[PDB]
Design a binder for this molecule. Structure first.
Ligand SMILES: [Cl-]
Length: 148
């Protein structure tokens, strides 16, 4: 299974892997002041990093299926999309572009939220027509999508 990581960046099982240099997740980075759930209409801004915002502290953007979005999160997270829990799908009608995530295969993906609430990834580069949806979350943990 793709490892989870604790708020200090340490792997909780398995082997650590690096994130893709072009990901919107830039490590090392702090997080986990508070768990702060946000709506899709109130995703945090890069300028909210030092100050927080009116919703609370901010370490970036985190997402899991539901969809559920967070601007900070203290528990275990993915640093890479756990592709074993994704399934091939056609491109959806996208409502929002949320970041660039490393997959558990090491590759870079663009990540989107669909009109149907599904989280979808599409390969950024190389092989054509790769597109997957996040259909299982057996550890009920979010991906750290962006760091501020
Ligand atoms: Cl997994």
């Amino acid at each position: 299974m793709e490892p989870l990581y604790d708020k200090n960046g340490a792997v909780l099982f398995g082997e650590p892997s690096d994130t893709h240099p072009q990901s919107t997740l830039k490590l090392p980075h702090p997080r986990g002041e508070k768990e702060v759930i946000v709506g899709i209409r109130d995703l945090p801004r890069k300028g909210d990093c030092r100050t927080g915002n009116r919703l609370g502290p901010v370490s970036g953007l985190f997402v899991k299926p539901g969809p559920v979005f967070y601007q900070d999160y203290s528990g275990p997270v993915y640093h890479r999309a756990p592709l074993e829990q994704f399934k091939q799908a056609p491109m959806c009608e996208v409502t929002k572009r949320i970041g660039r995530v490393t997959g558990s295969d090491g590759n870079l993906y663009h990540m989107y939220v669909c009109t149907d609430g599904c989280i979808l990834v599409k390969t950024a580069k190389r092989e054509g027509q790769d597109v997957l949806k996040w259909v299982y979350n057996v550890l009920d943990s979010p991906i750290w999508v962006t760091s501020c």
